[PDB]
Amino acid sequence: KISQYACQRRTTLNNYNQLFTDALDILAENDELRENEGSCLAFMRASSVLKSLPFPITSMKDTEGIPCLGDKVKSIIEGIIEDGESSEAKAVLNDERYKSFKLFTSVFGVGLKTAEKWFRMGFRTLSKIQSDKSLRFTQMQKAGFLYYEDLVSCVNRPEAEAVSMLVKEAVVTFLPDALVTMTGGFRRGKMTGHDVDFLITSPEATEDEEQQLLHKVTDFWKQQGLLLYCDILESTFEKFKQPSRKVALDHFQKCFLILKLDHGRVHSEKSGKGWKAIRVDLVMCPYDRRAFALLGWTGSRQFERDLRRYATHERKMMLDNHALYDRTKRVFLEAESEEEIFAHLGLDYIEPWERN
DNA sequence: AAAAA
Ligand SMILES: [Mn+2]
Ligand SMILES: [Mn+2]
Ligand code: NA
Numbered sequence A: 001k002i003s004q005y006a007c008q009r010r011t012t013l014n015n016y017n018q019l020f021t022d023a024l025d026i027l028a029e030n031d032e033l034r035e036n037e038g039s040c041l042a043f044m045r046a047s048s049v050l051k052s053l054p055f056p057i058t059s060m061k062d063t064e065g066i067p068c069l070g071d072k073v074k075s076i077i078e079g080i081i082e083d084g085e086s087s088e089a090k091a092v093l094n095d096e097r098y099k100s101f102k103l104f105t106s107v108f109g110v111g112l113k114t115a116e117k118w119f120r121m122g123f124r125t126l127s128k129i130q131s132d133k134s135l136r137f138t139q140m141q142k143a144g145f146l147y148y149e150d151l152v153s154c155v156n157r158p159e160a161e162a163v164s165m166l167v168k169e170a171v172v173t174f175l176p177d178a179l180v181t182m183t184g185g186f187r188r189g190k191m192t193g194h195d196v197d198f199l200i201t202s203p204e205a206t207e208d209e210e211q212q213l214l215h216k217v218t219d220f221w222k223q224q225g226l227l228l229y230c231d232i233l234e235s236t237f238e239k240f241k242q243p244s245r246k247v248a249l250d251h252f253q254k255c256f257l258i259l260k261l262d263h264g265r266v267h268s269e270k271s272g273k274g275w276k277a278i279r280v281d282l283v284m285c286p287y288d289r290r291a292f293a294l295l296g297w298t299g300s301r302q303f304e305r306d307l308r309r310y311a312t313h314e315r316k317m318m319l320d321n322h323a324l325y326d327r328t329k330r331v332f333l334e335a336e337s338e339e340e341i342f343a344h345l346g347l348d349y350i351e352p353w354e355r356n
Numbered sequence B: 001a002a003a004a005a
Helices: A018-032 A037-051 A071-083 A087-094 A096-105 A112-120 A126-129 A140-147 A148-151 A157-172 A207-224 A287-298 A303-313 A339-344
Strands: A179-182 A196-201 A225-232 A252-264 A275-284 A317-319 A324-326
Touching: A018 A037, A018 A071, A018 A087, A018 A096, A037 A071, A037 A303, A071 A087, A071 A140, A096 A112, A096 A126, A140 A148, A140 A157, A140 A225, A148 A275, A157 A179, A157 A196, A157 A207, A157 A252, A157 A275, A196 A287, A207 A275, A275 A324, A287 A339, A303 A317, A303 A339, A317 A339, A324 A339
Parallel strands: A196 A275
Antiparallel strands: A179 A196, A225 A252, A252 A275, A317 A324
């Protein structure tokens, strides 16, 4: 019996139901744009459960016993079985507001508010936005436009590994005992991604040394002429606060970067300007919270949402990227690994490549 | 506001 929770399912990259889930993901995205959080959630949960199936749905009978499949979702599945297409997802793909929001938010530094503003000004193309002489752009948007083609081009695994080497080389220069882990999609086994994420932690660094590492590493890259964009968010981490109930950024020190990746550093089968702009996120966390941060940054987004929902509604536990708190025992639960977090929650361990 | 798993 398939659980309603993604954290009680194994979801691997062999998706047998992409015809259904691509349509459900488009409908979910449109509901996000139309500020319909409820309908967004229903389509996300339906898409998520179908992603876990070990077989493709080929008739409506195949949906029997599957949770999170309401009447609206079942009408969409039925329509796709009928002629291989979703008329509902096709109408969203042709909607002018949806097309504009996808296109405008594809720019690094452009979110829902700026995309809405430009749409209501009558803009429909990125060429017309970039060349406009009255528009004013943030430093993030300037970098988003300057390196647009490289950033919309997926990072592959040889590129992610080349970035990992750069990160590790820079980090150990200032903290030789530091542990650097590639998180996000690549840790879940993905062949491609929009960016490369890392978690950095040090067993012996002080509170100040921990604070200074991201500044030292980015200044080093700035000197090397590799830092194309850099934004460091200082930590707001509280050692003794209860975990968050919010469904939001973690409080660890982090940085959102664009690095210059020289082609010579990439060891691929295919080995222009001779370099590629790469989005890189670095997160620094205290050593004792490394398992919670790793679990939160590994994802997927839906796996994280269900993990936190399961902890709260089924175990009366409060989980986030910094800690795990037991409301019944009135104690924080410690973990040195992700396995220990799953064991505290009463969950079978789900491998990172099973969290997709 | 937007940058995130
Ligand atoms: Mn990522
Ligand atoms: Mn990222
Ligand atoms: Na964006």
